[PDB]
Design a protein around this ligand. Structure first.
Ligand SMILES: CN(Cc1ccccc1)Cc1ccc(COc2ccc3c(CO)cc(=O)oc3c2)cc1
Ligand SMILES: CN(Cc1ccccc1)Cc1ccc(COc2ccc3c(CO)cc(=O)oc3c2)cc1
Ligand SMILES: *[C@@H]1O[C@H](CO)[C@@H](O)[C@H](O)[C@H]1NC(C)=O
Ligand SMILES: *[C@@H]1O[C@H](CO)[C@@H](O)[C@H](O)[C@H]1NC(C)=O
Ligand SMILES: *[C@@H]1O[C@H](CO)[C@@H](O)[C@H](O)[C@H]1NC(C)=O
Ligand SMILES: *[C@@H]1O[C@H](CO)[C@@H](O)[C@H](O)[C@H]1NC(C)=O
Lengths: 537, 535
């Protein structure tokens, strides 16, 4: 200390930090990167709940991103930016429980609402250091304090032998909760308001946010929630205790481990890469949009199934923003549904469609799988390849995202929550995936964080204006529980989603358009009829 | 003394009557016996051909209508009375009628044979809606309609018994068809161009003559208006026919042997049988009738579904279609919350209760499947939507989707198929507006009743009726409803499995549409059978 930037040195509960002054297109921001919030969950602490980071001495350098939690590296289209942008961009390590903070430069004088980002990645992948989650634009343009944390994924975050001491499960969610607690104690040192904390996340990150809504100890750590293209309810976000026990035991056998304590002791001796090499092999069926190690309904973090909790909980004090992208399902068809590729138009046959439905809803009986096929078939053109391709995408997107959030918006709204719903319909001019995928899963994030404002990124001017609109929507919601701008009047209003009117808005380059019904007919099939059909068969 | 009112058929001489139609006279021969009166020991028995008669038989007047139930729902309301018997009831009722132009045609003329509806429990060829004078006068057709036995007298069956073999009401129709072959040429008709057309149960009967091979040599073309041989109501299994007959016999005090049972039923006055007719249905129902054709293994060698799925229909041309609101008429006959005088705005609970009546064969899960399919999930409680959906459940389940299934199966297996939807509501209709275009109210337009100035139709409805008369008669002449003189687009395309094209019959010009309730009928025809099966 002495000759450095005095506006970049801050003290948190664990010691002193030195941040870095970053350039955003419109000015500087303060960045505090790689702050440790837990003891490294390594060695005998693998699979264990996180322990609070013990204080350090001296000034911790917080100028670069820290390790990415150990995870699978996608190799589907090697070197294709569509896949690589999601891949880890630092070293893989079990030592990975660090978080990041962006604030205005200099730091705000008055307490500023806080946004906490929870990344997605199917609970098997992801990192708070990816370019798509760059908090420098929200920090600079909106004056927000943004926090993002790494949490353990895959086996390290979610392998569970339910009821055991050494692998209780959901420790990846406990990693997230510990970071929320860290924001409670320390974010005031940066100018953030701990009494105005909004969680927002996407895909498994959105499901994570929803699970903090449903867990008691997490509810006192935040005040508002945004769930983008993900829900705690639905077919992929959770598994039963019995099913988590079987996948854990099977993976242990696949890595040579054949009493719970002896089992996890052996797992803790295996190299991390051994666990990643086998995690995908324990799914009960050939499937898309399902992940081996996800939150487990333990009777602890989750006292019951998410479906049961959103049916009975009280959410009057809660404001929630939820939505989907236009083509939630298309991204998943290229990862194992025959007939589908990023390099052709993926015009499939009726036979390929029927095979895809068995993969897309792998829990379905033969009768239930039929019911899906009859509903999604266009009976005036039942063999048309373009419709069959688009229907296969819609089946995956509706089943895993659109109808889960349509269900949760309705439940939360009926339990007294303030809900705002959107559909994101703009395809980025920079998108590298083919046209037939439309607006795929995850490609609204770069607009929420305001990447189009980076002039070196070749977005169009209207995409620059568009991203600024979304940034104001998201930050107005964090500030007020209401995405609408108080100053405005002429701009169309975003009404709350209600059971009586089921209103949502389209998010595209045109002004806000209000629509009614979130795929209402088709989601009645998924949310009301199909669960009753599955009991009978 | 009028020589064109005297015709000799193989049973002897007849004298008809000159009738006044708006454009000119017509020869009408009404009350021609085609069968021995099925009375006494001939009750429930197949018809026997009528024996020759001396002198000039007087064919000037409508004969008795077959003994049947007299509807009492809205007593004296024209909407219900127009279907009630308008001649005396009698088991002595096997007679047919013939309309020809006046003078009787020079060249042989294509014959249309009408088969009335009435749920196989009612109906008569003497109703005003079936007045054949307009088609005979305007289009120069030879029009024939017959009475056939309905209710227990037509279709109560002890399957396998000699005394009550079943389907005798259909045999009544077939005998009248043979009569047309042997005699219509004496009236100027062409026995080599005979077109059957009927509505509702009449349409179903037409479809069963398609599916019964001895009938097939008696006609060349068919029109099925708002009814099919396939579907949930038009037939019953032999086991269910024996159950219903056995319970009616017990209800009228008849107790063992097939022969002993049928004998006692023959000793019962007709009204006794009609009194308990309706109390033998297995469930509380709508659009279900107690005594209908039976899958006997004889007249119908298999279920109509099995027969349309495997038959050879190459040499066949068919016209098929529906009205816009097939099911609305049936709701006011037992569905709580529905009334002719009320607007029938129903609650959701009444809607769930109504679906169990409309699909009486449905398990709890199959009823929930229909409920969730037909609910409008943006307005799941709106009573106007729930009312209109109840009418659509009954209409699609019983008519529209059976029609679409038949049309597709016939077209796929050699037949030439033309399909329509009839969307005009008569300005003279007395049912409430919420019923729309109810089951059976295209008939008056096809027979040309608007051309009668005294019935107060609108002038466009007259032009409309003439268009429909030309579609039907051009179909009878050619197997193609398109006017060969008219040389403009749009033409009426055939219905195929691939394109699924049909036309809308309204006061606007013909409009071609593709897919006859395709998504919803996929539910009824493809999914629901599999569900009911595995439940
Ligand atoms: C590429 N990814 C981009 C993305 C979008 C949004 C948020 C975060 C990342 C979307 C995606 C994810 C997964 C798939 C296929 O499903 C998988 C892939 C890999 C695994 C792995 C690999 O070990 C383990 C597992 O349990 O389940 C998996 C399930 C396709 C597309
Ligand atoms: C009145 N009818 C008018 C009509 C329309 C189209 C063609 C012919 C007649 C349509 C109609 C028919 C039947 C009903 C209700 O269902 C019935 C009514 C009476 C019976 C009877 C009465 O004994 C016996 C039976 O087995 O089943 C029935 C079933 C409602 C509306
Ligand atoms: C698209 O490409 C994949 C992989 O090359 C292939 O399996 C699929 O059949 C292709 N589809 C079409 C319609 O060409
Ligand atoms: C933007 O375009 C320029 C040239 O037009 C190119 O050199 C640059 O790499 C592009 N940037 C991105 C992010 O694609
Ligand atoms: C409509 O009318 C009938 C008889 O007049 C009545 O029983 C029925 O309840 C009415 N419908 C409603 C919704 O009240
Ligand atoms: C037609 O209307 C007139 C009154 O304008 C009436 O006298 C006549 O009876 C009506 N005809 C019929 C068939 O109802």
């Amino acid at each position: 200390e002495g000759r450095e930037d005095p506006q970049l040195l801050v003290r948190v509960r664990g010691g002193q930090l030195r941040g870095i002054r970053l350039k955003a297109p419109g000015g500087p921001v303060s960045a505090f990167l790689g702050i440790p919030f837990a003891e490294p969950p390594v060695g005998s602490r693998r699979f264990m709940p996180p322990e609070p980071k013990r204080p350090w001495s001296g000034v911790l350098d917080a100028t670069t991103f820290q390790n990415v939690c150990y995870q699978y590296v996608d190799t589907l289209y090697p070197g294709f930016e569509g896949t690589e942008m999601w891949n880890p961009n630092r070293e893989l390590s079990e030592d990975c429980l660090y978080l990041n903070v962006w604030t205005p430069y200099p730091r705000p004088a008055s307490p500023t609402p806080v946004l906490i980002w929870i990344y997605g990645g199917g609970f098997y992948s992801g990192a708070a250091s990816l370019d798509v989650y760059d908090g420098r634009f929200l920090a600079q343009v909106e004056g927000a304090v943004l926090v993002s944390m790494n949490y353990r994924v895959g086996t390290f975050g979610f392998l569970a032998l339910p009821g055991s001491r050494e692998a209780p499960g959901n420790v990846g969610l406990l990693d997230q909760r510990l970071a929320l607690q860290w924001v409670q104690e320390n974010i005031a040192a940066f100018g953030g308001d701990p009494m105005s904390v909004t969680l927002f996340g996407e895909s498994a990150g959105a499901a994570s946010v929803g699970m903090h809504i449903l867990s008691l100890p997490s509810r006192s750590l935040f005040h508002r929630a945004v769930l983008q293209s993900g829900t705690p309810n639905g077919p992929w976000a959770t598994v039963s205790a019995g099913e988590a026990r079987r996948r854990a035991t099977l993976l242990a056998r696949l890595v040579g481990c054949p009493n719970d304590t002896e089992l996890i002791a052996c797992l803790r001796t295996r190299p991390a890469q051994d666990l990643v090499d086998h995690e995908w092999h324990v799914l009960p069926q050939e499937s898309i949009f399902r992940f081996s190690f996800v939150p487990v309904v333990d009777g602890d973090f989750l006292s019951d199934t998410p479906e049961a909790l959103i049916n009975t909980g009280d959410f009057q004090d809660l404001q929630v923003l939820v939505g989907v992208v236009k083509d939630e399902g298309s991204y998943f068809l290229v990862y194992g549904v025959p007939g589908f590729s990023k390099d052709n138009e993926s015009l499939i046959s009726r036979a390929q469609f029927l095979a895809g439905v068995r993969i897309g809803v792998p829990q379905a009986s033969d009768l239930a799988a039929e019911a899906v096929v009859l509903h999604y078939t266009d009976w005036l053109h039942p063999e048309d390849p373009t419709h069959l391709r688009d229907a296969m995408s819609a089946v995956v997107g509706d089943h895993n995202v659109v109808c889960p959030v349509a269900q949760l918006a309705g439940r939360l709204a009926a339990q007294g929550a303030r809900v705002y719903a959107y559909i994101f319909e703009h395809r980025a001019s920079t998108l590298t995936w083919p046209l037939w995928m439309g607006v795929p899963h995850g490609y609204e994030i770069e607009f929420i964080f305001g990447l189009p404002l980076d002039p070196s990124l070749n977005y169009t001017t209207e995409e620059r204006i568009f991203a600024q609109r979304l940034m104001k929507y998201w930050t107005n919601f964090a500030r007020t529980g209401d995405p609408n701008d108080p100053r405005d009047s002429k701009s169309p209003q975003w009404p709350p989603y209600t059971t009586a009117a089921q209103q949502y808005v389209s998010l595209n380059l045109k002004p806000l358009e209000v629509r009614r019904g979130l795929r209402a007919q088709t989601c009645a099939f998924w949310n009301r009829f199909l669960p009753k059909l599955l009991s009978a068969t």
